[PDB]
Motif scaffolding. Structure first.
Motif, mmCIF file in Angstrom:
data_model
loop_
_atom_site.group_PDB
_atom_site.id
_atom_site.type_symbol
_atom_site.label_atom_id
_atom_site.label_comp_id
_atom_site.label_asym_id
_atom_site.label_seq_id
_atom_site.Cartn_x
_atom_site.Cartn_y
_atom_site.Cartn_z
ATOM 1 N N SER B 178 0.880 -1.206 -0.044
ATOM 2 C CA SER B 178 -0.062 -0.189 0.119
ATOM 3 C C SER B 178 0.787 1.200 0.124
ATOM 4 C CB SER B 178 -0.663 -0.015 1.209
ATOM 5 O OG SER B 178 -1.658 1.193 1.268
ATOM 6 N N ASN B 179 0.725 1.955 -0.965
ATOM 7 C CA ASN B 179 1.394 3.458 -0.956
ATOM 8 C C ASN B 179 0.742 4.653 0.018
ATOM 9 O OD1 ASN B 179 -0.898 3.784 -2.382
ATOM 10 N ND2 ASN B 179 -0.073 5.110 -4.027
ATOM 11 N N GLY B 180 -0.400 3.704 0.812
ATOM 12 C CA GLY B 180 -1.244 4.537 2.056
ATOM 13 C C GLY B 180 -2.564 4.737 1.515
ATOM 14 N N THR B 181 -3.078 4.478 0.062
ATOM 15 C CA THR B 181 -4.284 4.654 -0.309
ATOM 16 C C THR B 181 -4.819 3.307 -0.877
ATOM 17 O OG1 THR B 181 -3.718 5.364 -2.430
ATOM 18 C CG2 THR B 181 -3.840 7.034 -0.640
ATOM 19 N N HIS B 182 -4.301 2.660 -2.079
ATOM 20 C CA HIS B 182 -4.798 1.741 -2.497
ATOM 21 C C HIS B 182 -3.604 0.525 -2.145
ATOM 22 C CE1 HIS B 182 -6.104 4.862 -5.225
ATOM 23 N NE2 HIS B 182 -7.013 4.081 -5.835
ATOM 24 N N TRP B 183 -4.374 -0.791 -2.234
ATOM 25 C CA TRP B 183 -3.596 -1.798 -1.968
ATOM 26 C C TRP B 183 -3.149 -2.696 -3.279
ATOM 27 C CZ3 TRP B 183 -1.645 -3.477 2.481
ATOM 28 C CH2 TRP B 183 -2.269 -2.711 3.739
ATOM 29 N N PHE B 184 -1.930 -3.153 -3.462
ATOM 30 C CA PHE B 184 -1.391 -3.664 -4.439
ATOM 31 C C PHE B 184 -0.760 -4.772 -4.245
ATOM 32 C CE2 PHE B 184 -0.646 0.923 -6.322
ATOM 33 C CZ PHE B 184 -2.099 1.014 -6.569
ATOM 34 N N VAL B 185 -0.833 -6.013 -5.133
ATOM 35 C CA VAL B 185 -0.007 -6.959 -4.930
ATOM 36 C C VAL B 185 0.976 -7.041 -5.957
ATOM 37 C CG1 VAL B 185 -1.305 -8.106 -6.824
ATOM 38 C CG2 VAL B 185 0.036 -9.554 -5.290
HETATM 39 C C1 LIG Z 1 -1.082 5.443 -4.727
HETATM 40 O O1 LIG Z 1 -1.125 4.852 -6.153
HETATM 41 C C2 LIG Z 1 -2.424 4.853 -6.730
HETATM 42 C C3 LIG Z 1 -2.367 4.324 -8.170
HETATM 43 O O2 LIG Z 1 -1.155 4.820 -8.667
HETATM 44 C C4 LIG Z 1 -2.617 6.399 -6.838
HETATM 45 O O3 LIG Z 1 -4.243 6.621 -7.557
HETATM 46 C C5 LIG Z 1 -3.802 7.063 -8.440
HETATM 47 O O4 LIG Z 1 -3.536 8.594 -8.636
HETATM 48 C C6 LIG Z 1 -3.287 9.264 -9.832
HETATM 49 C C7 LIG Z 1 -2.574 10.524 -9.434
HETATM 50 O O5 LIG Z 1 -1.534 10.415 -8.655
HETATM 51 C C8 LIG Z 1 -4.847 9.318 -10.483
HETATM 52 O O6 LIG Z 1 -4.649 9.891 -11.662
HETATM 53 C C9 LIG Z 1 -5.486 7.961 -10.496
HETATM 54 O O7 LIG Z 1 -6.788 8.347 -10.941
HETATM 55 C C10 LIG Z 1 -5.445 7.382 -9.148
HETATM 56 N N1 LIG Z 1 -6.357 5.933 -9.355
HETATM 57 C C11 LIG Z 1 -7.327 5.676 -8.998
HETATM 58 C C12 LIG Z 1 -7.798 4.428 -9.033
HETATM 59 O O8 LIG Z 1 -7.964 6.614 -8.465
HETATM 60 C C13 LIG Z 1 -2.504 7.294 -5.525
HETATM 61 O O9 LIG Z 1 -2.937 8.741 -5.713
HETATM 62 C C14 LIG Z 1 -1.289 6.790 -4.981
HETATM 63 N N2 LIG Z 1 -1.214 7.314 -3.359
HETATM 64 C C15 LIG Z 1 -0.065 7.954 -3.163
HETATM 65 C C16 LIG Z 1 -0.288 8.479 -1.750
HETATM 66 O O10 LIG Z 1 1.006 7.837 -3.491
#
Ligand SMILES: *[C@@H]1O[C@H](CO)[C@@H](O[C@@H]2O[C@H](CO)[C@@H](O)[C@H](O)[C@H]2NC(C)=O)[C@H](O)[C@H]1NC(C)=O
Ligand SMILES: *[C@@H]1O[C@H](CO)[C@@H](O[C@@H]2O[C@H](CO)[C@@H](O)[C@H](O)[C@H]2NC(C)=O)[C@H](O)[C@H]1NC(C)=O
Ligand SMILES: *[C@@H]1O[C@H](CO)[C@@H](O[C@@H]2O[C@H](CO)[C@@H](O)[C@H](O)[C@H]2NC(C)=O)[C@H](O)[C@H]1NC(C)=O
Ligand SMILES: *[C@@H]1O[C@H](CO)[C@@H](O[C@@H]2O[C@H](CO)[C@@H](O)[C@H](O)[C@H]2NC(C)=O)[C@H](O)[C@H]1NC(C)=O
Ligand SMILES: *[C@@H]1O[C@H](CO)[C@@H](O[C@@H]2O[C@H](CO)[C@@H](O)[C@H](O)[C@H]2NC(C)=O)[C@H](O)[C@H]1NC(C)=O
Ligand SMILES: *[C@@H]1O[C@H](CO)[C@@H](O)[C@H](O)[C@H]1NC(C)=O
Ligand SMILES: *[C@@H]1O[C@H](CO)[C@@H](O)[C@H](O)[C@H]1NC(C)=O
Ligand SMILES: *[C@@H]1O[C@H](CO)[C@@H](O)[C@H](O)[C@H]1NC(C)=O
Lengths: 73, 228, 319
Positions: B178-185
């Protein structure tokens, strides 16, 4: 100018607090070297840099990039 | 591929300098030669010893004495010299067992390192191992181990598991990050985050057991297909 | 349990052969380089006795230290991790070992058979086996493949099962059950170490061979070798220089041979060790720092991890 080791009485080398890589081993973890007006020094061998690995139960560190190194055995 | 080409071709570039500019490179092999030339040279100086005989030159005693007395003197030279070989041979047999032990470790690598890929950590050199290149050297062999060493790091929050419906999803290969928002594998040894799907993960147990499982939504590739 | 280094010895051949005697010491020069080629043999041993302790224990370029707060998921490592309380800083289990392994040396230095000190102290060895262990715990198995990478420990065991073919869903569901089984397993090691003297019988023999080989090398001074008396100072007081040559050269040729027997024993015995310090250096890389797919190399059963523990002139793995 007489230093005491755990190995035995040493004579002719100034003690130094700065622990370096072992250069001329001696014994009981003492290593002497000619690096320093020059003279022979003696010091407690250094095991290498100390590194604390930050540890926490929720956190992992995944490398994003790599290097290809060629070593000669 | 291009990025590795540059990194590989440059790596071989550095070996030249480390070989040519540093005499200690072959210090193993140069000692293997400097032991024999040291053991033979000493075995010749042994001819200069009296061993209790009146003189060390075998031709002096014979010119200086009768056969009856020379027996007493010469047999002190022979028993001494003949012993100084049994010392030399005994040194070799030992030293040649030291080598025969290293020529196995070299024959083991050559099979398990060059000809294969070695899963054995730090047998083929520090880091994950890709291939090795044998190179002959005098009375020896020199391997070039091409190894894979990870470089840049990032702290990631991770979790062992994901509650979706209460089924606990675990990764097939890799871990959750997790980069703090989304969970990734993503796979362990290189960072390539992918979106968590039912085909990235498998289902086991439930959320009442796992310690540390976190809540998230596990994307399902099928749902948008039947929604079509 | 494996031996690693053997007691570094050095002989003074001028002093052992002709004890502190001028009339004899001159004679030993005719025999020449015998004296000087022993100390070239016993030095080649004592140099690689440092190379062994070097290759085994220090395979890691940095000394890691244990993080103060321990949450490993129920796994209790206090046993194997360092204790600040002891004057020398060593894990609880190492102390059980140093108690097992154990005038005499006053009659060894008088003849010449001395004992050099090992390069690495018994203290420094404890700082390596703290690092290696502190890398294995926190950083996973990657600290030997490069810079260390922290990982949640309970997530590490999830990998080390994916090696042995047990899918990781078995761990996390059983984590508590494994905590009890692991922490109890380390519990049994203490008794098996403390209550059984044969535990270190490998290492205690490695020490009992040298003290056996040196002790015998001193008794050799009591042999006549055909000379009229075994005390070098008797013959010189009892005879002329012309006849003592006949008698003394029987003592020298005998004693000088009794070293070439001792050295030849060491070179062989130090090759036995140099073969075991490879098997210990091979494990330490392929067993502690990695996970071994090699069956019954790292011990009976599928292998998860190993914990190195220093021991006198040796190393002790907990597989
Ligand atoms: C964590 O990673 C996710 C995926 O790359 C980021 O979500 C995306 O952020 C970008 C801008 O940075 C947007 O254009 C996308 O639409 C986002 N994805 C979705 C599915 O909404 C997220 O911002 C990152 N967070 C951090 C704190 O790095
Ligand atoms: C991964 O690391 C390599 C080098 O270790 C990076 O390649 C370098 O990129 C810089 C640009 O910032 C160039 O100046 C160098 O010449 C490059 N080196 C080589 C050998 O090509 C690479 O960009 C990194 N990749 C990522 C994603 O971080
Ligand atoms: C993740 O979400 C679940 C529900 O989706 C949470 O489960 C709750 O747990 C508390 C504590 O036992 C119960 O009182 C609630 O009734 C549960 N919710 C439901 C809907 O059943 C769970 O707590 C969440 N994760 C964390 C770490 O809190
Ligand atoms: C790890 O185990 C040790 C012993 O197995 C625990 O130390 C004991 O703690 C109790 C208190 O609960 C004391 O009465 C004992 O004297 C301690 N023994 C020793 C040898 O120190 C320790 O608390 C455990 N640690 C964790 C985190 O579980
Ligand atoms: C797997 O085996 C372990 C022990 O080998 C079982 O745990 C024991 O369960 C009994 C209850 O019947 C308890 O009395 C013991 O204290 C438990 N031991 C430990 C270390 O926890 C476990 O129940 C078994 N699991 C299955 C599914 O059979
Ligand atoms: C080493 O440092 C300590 C304090 O840092 C000092 O007291 C001591 O004198 C130093 N050693 C030498 C040999 O100067
Ligand atoms: C990760 O967090 C620790 C916490 O102290 C920090 O020391 C480390 O530098 C962080 N990682 C990176 C790549 O900075
Ligand atoms: C991680 O450690 C914190 C304390 O620092 C604790 O509150 C939390 O429950 C722990 N989580 C797991 C999964 O062990």
């Amino acid at each position: 100018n007489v230093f005491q080791t755990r190995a035995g009485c040493l004579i002719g080398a100034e003690h130094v607090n700065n622990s370096y890589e072992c250069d001329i081993p001696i014994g009981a973890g003492i290593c002497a070297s000619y690096q320093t007006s020059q003279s022979i020094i003696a010091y407690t061998m250094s095991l290498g840099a100390e590194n604390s690995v930050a540890y926490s139960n929720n956190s992992i560190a995944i490398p994003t990039n790599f290097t290809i190194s060629v070593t000669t055995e | 591929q291009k990025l590795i080409a540059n990194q590989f071709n440059s790596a071989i570039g550095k070996i030249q300098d480390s070989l040519s500019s540093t005499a200690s490179a072959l210090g193993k092999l140069q000692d293997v030669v400097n032991q024999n030339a040291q053991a033979l040279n000493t075995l010749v100086k042994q001819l200069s010893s009296n061993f209790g005989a009146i003189s060390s030159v075998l031709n002096d005693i014979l010119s200086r004495l009768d056969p009856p007395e020379a027996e007493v003197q010469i047999d002190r030279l022979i028993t001494g010299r003949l012993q100084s070989l049994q010392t030399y041979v005994t040194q070799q047999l030992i030293r040649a067992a030291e080598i025969r032990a290293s020529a196995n470790l070299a024959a083991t690598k050559m099979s398990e390192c060059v000809l294969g890929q070695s899963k054995r950590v730090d047998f083929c050199g520090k880091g994950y191992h890709l291939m090795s290149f044998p190179q002959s050297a005098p009375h020896g062999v020199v391997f070039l181990h091409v190894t894979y060493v990870p470089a840049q790091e990032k702290n990631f929050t991770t979790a062992p598991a994901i509650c979706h419906d209460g089924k606990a999803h675990f990764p097939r290969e890799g871990v959750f990050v997790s980069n703090g928002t989304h969970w990734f594998v993503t796979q362990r040894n290189f960072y390539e985050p992918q979106i968590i799907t039912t085909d990235n993960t498998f289902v086991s147990g439930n959320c009442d057991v796992v310690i540390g499982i976190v809540n998230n939504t596990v994307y399902d590739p099928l749902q948008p297909e039947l929604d079509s | 349990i494996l031996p690693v280094s053997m007691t570094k010895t050095s002989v003074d051949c001028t002093m052992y052969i002709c004890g502190d005697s001028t009339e004899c010491s001159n004679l030993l020069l005719q025999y020449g380089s015998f004296c000087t080629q022993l100390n070239r043999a016993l030095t080649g041993i004592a140099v690689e006795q440092d190379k062994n302790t070097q290759e085994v224990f220090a395979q890691v370029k940095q000394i890691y230290k244990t993080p103060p707060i321990k949450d490993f998921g129920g796994f209790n490592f206090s046993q194997i991790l360092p204790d600040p309380s002891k004057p020398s800083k060593r894990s609880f289990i190492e102390d059980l070992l140093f108690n097992k392994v154990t005038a005499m040396q006053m009659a060894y230095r008088f003849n010449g058979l001395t004992v050099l000190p090992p390069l690495l102290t018994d203290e420094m060895i404890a700082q390596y086996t703290s690092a290696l262990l502190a890398g294995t715990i926190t950083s996973g198995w990657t600290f030997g493949a490069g810079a260390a990478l922290q990982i949640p420990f309970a997530m590490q065991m999830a990998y080390r099962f994916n090696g042995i073919g047990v899918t990781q869903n078995v761990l996390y569901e059983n984590q508590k059950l494994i905590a009890n089984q692991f922490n109890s397993a380390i519990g049994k090691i203490q008794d098996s170490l403390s209550s059984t003297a044969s535990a270190l019988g490998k290492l205690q023999d490695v020490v009992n061979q040298n003290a056996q080989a040196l002790n015998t090398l001193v008794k050799q001074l009591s042999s006549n070798f055909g000379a009229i008396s075994s005390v070098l100072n008797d013959i010189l007081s009892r005879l002329d220089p012309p006849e003592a040559e006949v008698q003394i050269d029987r003592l020298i040729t005998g004693r000088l041979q009794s070293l070439q027997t001792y050295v030849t024993q060491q070179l062989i015995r130090a090759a036995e060790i140099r073969a075991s310090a490879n098997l210990a250096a091979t494990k330490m890389s392929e067993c502690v720092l990695g996970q071994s797919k090699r069956v019954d190399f790292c011990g009976k059963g599928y292998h998860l991890m190993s914990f190195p523990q220093s021991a006198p002139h040796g190393v002790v793995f907990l597989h």
